């Protein structure tokens, strides 16, 4: 059976791009530009920060200075962070808590491969941090869309092979990072999103210790 279960964040443990919505809004007002609403925001999923700055310029054609542009982008940051502190063990998503109580009672280790820069306070302030074993530091390791770098690097701090883990992921480029770690995916959302080839639950409420174990199962026979 499994050794370990590899967690992203972001879509799986909890959803983080609502306070980024939140952060950017605060900017564009800051600056004067219409138009940043949630219709907008969803041009924002899975864009680089500067990218989505760009984006977010161009809403009002606007051209600033390599200087101005950095300190924009540090404002929408420091806006995020801010944002961020009133995240709480409200915003797990569901079937999650049970999920670590779960793995950890079997002694299963419990990972977060998250690119997340922002990571352990966000675990701090939902309180999961005591069912983590590890989390994988994306500032060492390139967590760049699709890089097993991640998975590898969380199977190995708890102790494990990535093929002895499970990873969870939400993203098409999540699903591909675990693969090619040599983890076996599952993913959560809809079958047009994610793949043909993996395991699919529509919702984390479908992350059961239960289910896990019937995909590893069917995996091995
Ligand atoms: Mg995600």
């Not at 590899?6 to 900017?27: M, N, S």
Request: proline share 4%; hydrophobic share 45%; aromatic share 8%.
């Amino acid at each position: 059976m499994f050794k370990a279960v590899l967690f992203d964040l972001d879509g799986v443990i909890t959803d983080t791009a609502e306070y980024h919505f939140r952060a950017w809004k605060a900017l564009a007002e800051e600056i004067g530009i219409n138009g940043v609403d949630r219709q907008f925001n969803e041009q924002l999923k899975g864009v680089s920060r500067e990218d989505s700055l760009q984006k977010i310029l161009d809403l009002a054609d606007k051209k600033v200075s390599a200087e101005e542009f950095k300190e924009l982008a540090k404002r929408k940051n420091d806006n995020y962070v801010k944002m961020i502190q009133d995240v709480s063990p409200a915003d797990v998503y569901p079937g999650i808590l049970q999920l670590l109580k779960d793995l950890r009672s079997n002694k299963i280790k419990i990972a977060l491969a998250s690119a997340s820069k922002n990571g352990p306070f966000l675990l701090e302030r939902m309180n999961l941090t005591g069912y983590f074993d590890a989390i994988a530091d994306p500032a060492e390791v390139a967590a760049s869309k699709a890089a097993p770098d991640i998975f590898i690097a969380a199977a190995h701090a708890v102790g494990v092979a990535p093929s002895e883990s499970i990873g969870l992921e939400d993203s098409q480029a999540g699903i591909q990072a675990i693969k090619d770690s040599g983890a076996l995916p599952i993913g959560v959302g809809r079958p047009e999103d994610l793949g043909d080839d993996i395991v699919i639950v529509p919702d984390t409420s479908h992350y059961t210790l239960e289910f896990l174990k019937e995909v590893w199962l069917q995996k091995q026979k």
